[PDB]
Amino acid sequence: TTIVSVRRNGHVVIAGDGQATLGNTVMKGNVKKVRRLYNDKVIAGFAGGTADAFTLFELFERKLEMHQGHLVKAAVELAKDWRTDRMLRKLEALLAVADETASLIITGNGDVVQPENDLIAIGSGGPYAQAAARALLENTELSAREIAEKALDIAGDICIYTNHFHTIEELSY
Amino acid sequence: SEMTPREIVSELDKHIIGQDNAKRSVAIALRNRWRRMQLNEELRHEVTPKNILMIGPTGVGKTEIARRLAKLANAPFIKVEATKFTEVGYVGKEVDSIIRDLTDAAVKMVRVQAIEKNRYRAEELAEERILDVLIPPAKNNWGQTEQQQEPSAARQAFRKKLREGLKIKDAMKLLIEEEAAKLVNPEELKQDAIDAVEQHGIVFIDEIDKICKRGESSGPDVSREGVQRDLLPLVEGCTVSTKHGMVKTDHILFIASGAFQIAKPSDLIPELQGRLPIRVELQALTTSDFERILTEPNASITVQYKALMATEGVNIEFTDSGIKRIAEAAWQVNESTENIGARRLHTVLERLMEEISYDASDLSGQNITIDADYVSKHLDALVADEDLSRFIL
């Protein structure tokens, strides 16, 4: 799959495709890889278990609960539980979460990464997404949503594991 | 003839800064208890307390509100940590202890409340026991019926000569702890408390959110939710075995409190959600908020400090810029390290005043002035050194 987050001006987005693959066949084509959390204040995307995500997004949203809402802290506190607990440690998936403050990547390896210009591109198509998301953010005035989306379509074109079904979320401030 | 909500909020304003909604909330609870007493027997049974759930960050007013509310209603009050009971999966303790602990405090009250409302009469009759071992013209009559009757004459000048003047004083106190007791009725006193608990009890349950779900694990959620289950009867209406009697939780007012950063009130057990009909949020405090807390409350910390120092014959004065400076510090530390709400003020205010607090007795008669200069000199360094902050502030 491919998830692409971009942040320009007062907008930050997270777009993802809808293909779910098994072997060499497409299982589903309209999977919802992006969603809103923490009273719509937080937007996130996931690459992997359509349920593993569920479990994760919630716990994450449990971190933001009694930690004011500090995106970064609750994010590192999550990867912490994630890499520890046998339960959490069991599930595998790439997490891409953003918010007014900043966007970052969370992984099972208890890793909390924040790409260069808050530009995230995970999933089997992340590279393609990023290469295109770059060429644009670099030589274009296009909005965060226009790049995320245009970059996402480019990925879908190259990546055999990503389709052109989008699911975008945004955040304005 | 109780106060109206606006009246209740007002009084609350005298101690708590901001958090208006929470006040109106906790205020409607109180008023409703009055409202209920004003109905027919039938309805008086059907109308139960409108229990409240406060949602908000640490030290921003939750408990203070509940505490002041209870105070204003002269109601027995008790605070309790929800997670305390999840421990029962090892040994912990049982929820019924809440009503039990509540009653015990409800007794300690009715007691001190009644004994104090007596220490004055017992002292007066006490002297009437001493002013009897100095001039005993007891019995009926003695001299005249009118003029000569009044035996006070020498006695009067005798008691005064003693009041302002074994050992009278040593004797009276002994008589005080003999007449007071010989005046208390421990029967109705035991039931007095129970009635309180049953009609004005206020139970504060902190960490309600820590008793919720989370895809965590079977074991833990089972321990957590159990505390919720064990809470149901208290809140739904039941009877508890009191070391001093039998209490009906039926009309006790419950004020639960949760951050809900991790968990949402909707994760709470259904039965509970039903019994927490009122939801209210409290906001994080602002530096401005802080400045007001430091001074506005009528027994503010700043006022306390000034008083404490006066004790030592030292006059303290807080400049506005001084207060502002103090407030910013607390905020700065809370943001740079860990946000603990208004609590931070006490730590800061207290570190700031150390040198004086110590030298106090020596500056007897001086006019110290804590202005922005002083504050900065004393706190700026500490506030800056983060690691030092996590120890000293």
CATH class of chain A: Alpha Beta
- Binned, the helix content of chain B reads 40-55%
Largest sheet of chain A: 5 strands, antiparallel
The CATH C-level class name of the largest domain in chain B: Alpha Beta
Shape of chain B: flat
* CATH architect. name of chain A: 4-Layer Sandwich
Number of strands of chain B: 9
Helix content of chain A: 25-40%
Q: What string gives the helices and strands of chain B in order?
A: HHHEHEHHHHHEHEEEHEHHEHHHEHH
Organism (chain B): Escherichia coli (strain K12)
GO molecular function (chain B): ATP binding; ATP hydrolysis activity; identical protein binding; magnesium ion binding; peptidase activity; proteasome-activating activity; protein domain specific binding
Protein name (chain B): ATP-dependent protease ATPase subunit HslU
Subunit structure (chain B): A double ring-shaped homohexamer of HslV is capped on each side by a ring-shaped HslU homohexamer. The assembly of the HslU/HslV complex is dependent on binding of ATP.
Question: Keywords for this structure?
Answer:
part of a larger assembly, 2 chains, A: Glutamine Phosphoribosylpyrophosphate, subunit 1, domain 1, five-stranded antiparallel β-sheet, four-stranded antiparallel β-sheet, B: 393 residues, alpha/beta, Rossmann fold, Helicase, Ruva Protein, domain 3, 3 domains, two-stranded antiparallel sheet, 9 strands, ATPase_AAA_core (chain B), protein domain specific binding (chain B), proteasome-activating activity (chain B), stress response (chain B)
Mind explaining what this structure looks like?
The structure is cut from a larger assembly and holds chains A (173 residues) and B (393 residues). Chain A has a single domain, classed as Aminohydrolase, N-terminal nucleophile (Ntn) domain (Glutamine Phosphoribosylpyrophosphate, subunit 1, domain 1, 4-Layer Sandwich). Chain A contains 5 helices and 11 strands; from the N terminus they run ββββββαααββββααβ. Chain A has helices at 52-63, 71-84, 86-90, 126-139, 144-158; strands at 3-8, 11-16, 20-22, 25-28, 34-37, 42-48, 93-98, 104-107, 111-113, 120-122, 167-172. In chain A, the strands form 3 sheets. A 5-stranded antiparallel sheet of chain A has the order 5-6-7-8-9, covered by helices on one side. In chain A, helix 1 (52-63) crosses helix 2 (71-84) and helix 4 crosses helix 5. The longest helix of chain A has 15 residues, at 144-158. The relative contact order of chain A is 0.26. Chain B has 393 residues and is of the alpha/beta class. Chain B folds into 3 domains: 1-108 and 194-282, P-loop containing nucleotide triphosphate hydrolases (Rossmann fold, 3-Layer(aba) Sandwich); 109-193, Ubiquitin-associated (UBA) domain (Helicase, Ruva Protein, domain 3, Orthogonal Bundle); 285-392, Helicase, Ruva Protein, domain 3. The longest helix of chain B has 20 residues, at 97-116. Chains A and B meet through helix 1 of A and loops of B. The PDB classes it as chaperone/hydrolase. The entry lists the keywords hslvu, peptidase-atpase complex, chaperone-hydrolase complex.
